[PDB]
Design a protein around this ligand. Structure first.
Ligand code: O3G
Ligand code: O3G
Ligand code: O3G
Ligand code: O3G
Ligand code: O3G
Lengths: 348, 348, 348, 348, 348
């Protein structure tokens, strides 16, 4: 017995849709959902999605309030829909999927993922929910996350971090590291050996290794000397080159964070969404150096060092493919006389 | 247990809100209420009101589908709100009243007209509903319509016509003529002696007396001779004067209807609402004569002749107040040498 | 090379999208698509769909401008999507299907109906287009219309009428009667024996048989005597019963059209869409008789007489299922002492 | 002292902006301007323009309520702006010009047409307004309409018809035929010899010559014999050819009007604006014949016969340029063995 | 070959419109431009302008991504339009000019600034673009910025700072100080000797002279003693007077910045735009002192000291006109017994 007034009642008294019974007066004026509280209209939800206001309101209310995989991971693993839940994309203020399975009468393509309409879709199953592991086994295409082992199925250990209500974190009171499983056309497909991005903020950056603690504390010349990174172009790639009108390098987020405490800069996120490699139109406020498309990845500095110090440096220009967050991130490695010149996450 | 989906279910399966149980998927895109019918969004309601889309949707669904007094009569009798119903203003595509009594949680000022909030409002009571006559007796201010006689109360016989779902008609299968009662500050008022407008369409005009049958059939000179209307300016007032750049007269709808069969014309209803006297920016397509504000009343021709012959014709210009549809309509009577020049419903 | 400006160029110079090259300046203000014509913004399209303005603009521009099956027939045959065309629903001012195959990059689920995403959808194939008959043979689910005979396949002769640009007509200069074929899970289905609705307007009604010519010309008592329809309740079912406050019967459009010449009435199409049985909130302007849900079907009078005389009249109330426009329409047959009382298209 | 509330006061009490003083409460909800009338919001204006709601409201209120040249004539004469008035385009529900001279503070480029900003614009001057003829003399570019003769200036007699409040008419109580004058770069131009379109409706068509009276009354074979039009392709050009799937000809509105009495048809005005030649996506309801772009001109039949008989019929295909409504209209004349095949207003 | 999809393709792959070829799917829902990225709609632009969504999208995409003069400077110099570029007003989230020259088909008044329509407009020319200096020479009215000297033309050295992508900065890797030239009616007009505002933030304030370093470090009494500013009312003008219910003075931004580190305050920018003198409705959170219109200018403290210590202090109240950012900023100087009382940027 689903209604706009019942969804709004749950939002008011529970913080989200909890399945409780009751109704509150609701008014819809344009893209905002209001509720009458003692004679005054109070704002409950503002629709920033491409879905009707009341439909988006309900999907937001029915969002998954448990630690869930980050949207970048589920996209990298080809997820089209989520089974009996709404994975909310907080980076886009909209559902990660536009169609649902057993969530909202307006977006539901099916009530159960067993329906033949779901067959060609990679459905996401949450093993922490009863019967979801069995549904993964019966579905043609899908992705499964589990807290433990699923008998017979070879797991892929995922990232330490999951997104809890938009807050990406490594769980202390909750489990955020999941075992991942994928199926394509009924066959369990083996997930590749992968690196993971650390999902850190530029303004809230914290080092997660001694190399990262040393990068932010030590100066450019002594860090490169301490970690033997001579001839690997860290001065351009990680640190940046703001001397000319076009910003040079600055492809690792640790280098951007080190730069941010000295000089502020405008990172224009021209495609606001979650991805393994993010692109920004950067403008440096101190020098006036700028780059229209500055591809930035947040790898653990040790992992970027392991990738860069595992490449052949004798080719003028070659594509270096690396598996990060399950997807193959192609990099452009440029060399000269046995030393690196640049190594950026190649733009496609 | 009121909801958007339940109101929409009733609209789909019953034509209006009938109190039935059930829900249909609803989507709100801007000011339109849609419903999913076999995978396609079908339009259910387009909000032309100043109220939120879903609030207006519900009040429209909960509209009174019985013959009710025309909004002009209800305004003339100073009604503010309706008791336990929604009088829908089809001429404005909105409720006749913005606040309700026991209809919608969003517009309800009270659940029962007995509440002290209703005390200063002239509440409309429908005698055909059980207990509404008793509520009129207990209310401080109000208007009551009844099909029969009320104990002790002296009635006022209203118009022959009522509005059934926007279609104004004189009932054959239903009763449309009501007894009217009014109360101001607890005191049963004596309603005035009044004329009634006939509420006819220009394109669907039908004569309702031998004088009206003769007006439309006979020529100007013959009709005025037959009914001895010489010196009463019917040639200007009723028939019209399209010889100059400014349209002369044409204040009675019977003369507009006679004119409409011969030559078409543009009536610009610049204030779309129901009123005893309607104003139109008229442009005659044949001659090119026009009038910015052409006040038109639809009186029975016999009633207009009775009013015009009941006047003193010795004043150059005087205001002639006539009680029509219970309200006092001011007319401007202009005379010259004992004869009328014009008699129009005063632009005030 | 698809763009908003190119679609708009085609609309301006060709009347619809014809694949021509060129661009015109376009401006989008809210839900309207405008074009600059000599310095003035001219309206090109107003979006009445649930899709983004520019997406709907393109699908409308790319609509099928050839006689196509009526949306009621296509729904009745369970069609989900059209192959390499846009069937435009003129009764809803929106595409008949929200997803396309090889039409618009925004709505396209696939470029060709052979893609595995189309497999569970009943794709509509137009035999008049090269290679569409072969695609029907290869598709798992689908509906096929052809002007001629298909090798091996047993046809179903459809309605005489098709919809050409929203104008339903029986072709004289074009062919509008199609052979229909259906496939479910790869198996060519045997379509049922069906009656067809005549798709006539209330205001533009024309008789299509001597019985219909006699119905509109003769009086109630004479027609029923001439065609020996005594005891079949035609006086209530077809003609109508406007004597009481609730309109009795009036389920056949021929009786509504006969009534319309004498007295006008308000048909409130509360679910604006194309269907075999249409429901209307009717209000008769002469009597004041009304019905919230008045189910109306436009069968050829001969076909309704053949259906009503092919029934057992000994049950107080039974459901009579009739295959009309390929779908099973349930009727409610009410009898008393061997005679009919009512026979309406069941409100279910 | 201009305000939204004062414009709205004038609209309510005068039908349009008359310069009167006073204010009424106004509320703006989205694109509609409402006014509070006795506690209920009444709609005053719905913005169908590309301008802000209140700006468009004011320009509409300040529209020219005198017979003015039709927007097709004003465009043909290359007018950009009107001097101290608003020419309202009723075919587009918007001002004919987006910028004003002494009308609205929001759209005003200048308070007087003498300002140097107006210098490169062809300003329209209405001779019926005091001082407008003198302003035409002083302006660099402009168009002037007058009821009488202007000293020294050689006139161009315009169309018999002008547009009075959207109603195109030939004045009986007003003058609608104007003398036209044009100036380009300070030089009084000699306007060309021109034909005029008759600006008639398809549904409200009236013949304006004996040839037009004979066209609508006589049959195709009789009319062509009476007026000796053998070999001029009137059977295709004027009458139409609905035998094939593509509608043949039908370029003259008199032939469309003759056709309309017999069979109805859908004229899709895909570019809603006023022009000398109008294009329509036509669909004939009887035959099912259709044409994506059917160019239609309303010339007096005598003028079309004078044009078609004034041509050389020995070229397979040539462009025939005709001055109509002051603009050069290109026609495509197709001949074969000394006879016409088609002569349509060229799709360019 | 300009299109919405091509502009959106450039925004996605280049950060701005770079002239590249290609298209991405675009959807417009209300005032937001979305793009389909792997089946999910990602937001690309939200229209905060008074222009149509797609028109504003294109002008924003085509914005000048080089250091350009600040909008306050170009307004002060009377600029109406920019030649073959879009100067984007980041303080208003809209183009600095509503009409373009060779940028967008919808906003273009001309393709080249040489067109006679541009003649009365002060067109902005960027000398850094090939042929723009020659176009300035040929234009009737205009403003020209150059990095070097233009033979014969007497330059005006502009501000040290220019706006690079909304970030106002003094160039280190780019040149931000330009030579300015102006022409009025074909004549090169001599630019006045002017002071420049420093364009600093209240929250991000940095001193740019020893006097400013001393103002923020030293207390009120020792700064005024060190710089001999006794009897010049710096205690009221620069520092502020929060003792009464109406805030006293606080007209220099350096004084506001000094105050901000001690006590926070609400600066209500009631006219959000770039100007030499900014007005704010200030409310001091600590004391509760407030001023409806508090005019604030950011002059270098040395320049304000040079202006105040160059005035005659014997008049009770006089207007002191000073040229700042090329425009004459009139100040109100109030004196008493040879000492200043107040000196604020006079409100007009
Ligand atoms: F839970 C969900 C998480 C993410 C999504 C959207 N992923 C779209 C995609 C599909 C195929 C390949 C790459 C991306 C949908 C639901
Ligand atoms: F049923 C209804 C019918 C009419 C109304 C609105 N009447 C407004 C009014 C109030 C006082 C004097 C004049 C007009 C409200 C409900
Ligand atoms: F051409 C088209 C015509 C019609 C449609 C929509 N039919 C929806 C439907 C699906 C299943 C059963 C009943 C109705 C889609 C495309
Ligand atoms: F009164 C008016 C009537 C018409 C207009 C608009 N005419 C636009 C145009 C300009 C140049 C050539 C062709 C068309 C503006 C005001
Ligand atoms: F690049 C541009 C920068 C600024 C503008 C807007 N300046 C408007 C103005 C005009 C006259 C005097 C004062 C202000 C337009 C384009």
């Amino acid at each position: 017995a689903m209604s706009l007034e019942n969804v709004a009642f749950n939002v008011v008294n529970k913080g989200h849709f909890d399945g409780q019974q009751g109704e509150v007066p609701v008014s819809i004026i344009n893209n905002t959902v209001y509720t009458k509280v003692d004679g005054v209209d109070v704002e409950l939800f503002e629709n920033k999605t491409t879905l009707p206001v009341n439909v988006a309101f309900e999907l937001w209310a029915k969002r998954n309030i448990k630690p869930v995989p980050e949207v970048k991971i589920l996209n990298n693993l080809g997820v089209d829909i989520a089974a009996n839940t709404v994975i909310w994309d907080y980076k886009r203020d909209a559902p990660a999927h536009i169609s649902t399975i057993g969530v909202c009468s307006m977006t539901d393509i099916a009530k159960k993922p067993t329906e033949t309409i779901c067959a060609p879709l990679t459905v996401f199953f949450d093993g922490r929910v009863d019967g979801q592991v069995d549904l993964f086994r019966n579905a043609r295409n899908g992705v499964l996350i589990t807290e433990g082992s699923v008998k017979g199925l070879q797991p892929s250990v995922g990232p330490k971090q999951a997104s809890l209500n938009g807050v990406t974190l490594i769980g202390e009171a909750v489990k955020t590291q999941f075992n991942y499983y994928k199926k394509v056309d009924g066959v369990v497909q083996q997930l590749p050996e992968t690196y993971f991005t650390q999902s850190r903020n530029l303004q809230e950056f914290k080092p997660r290794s001694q190399m990262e603690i040393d990068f932010l504390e030590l100066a450019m010349d002594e860090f490169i000397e301490r970690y033997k990174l001579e001839g690997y172009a860290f001065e351009h790639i990680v640190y940046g080159d703001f001397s000319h009108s076009q910003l040079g390098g600055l492809h690792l987020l640790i280098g951007l964070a080190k730069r941010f405490k000295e000089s502020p800069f405008e990172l224009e996120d021209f495609i606001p969404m979650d991805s393994t490699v993010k692109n920004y139109f950067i403008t440096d406020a101190q020098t006036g150096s700028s780059k229209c498309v500055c591809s930035v990845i947040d790898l653990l500095l040790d992992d970027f060092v392991e990738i860069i110090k595992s490449q052949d440096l004798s080719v003028v220009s070659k594509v270096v493919k690396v598996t990060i967050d399950y997807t193959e991130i192609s990099f452009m490695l440029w060399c000269k006389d046995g030393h690196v010149e640049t190594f950026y996450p190649k733009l496609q």
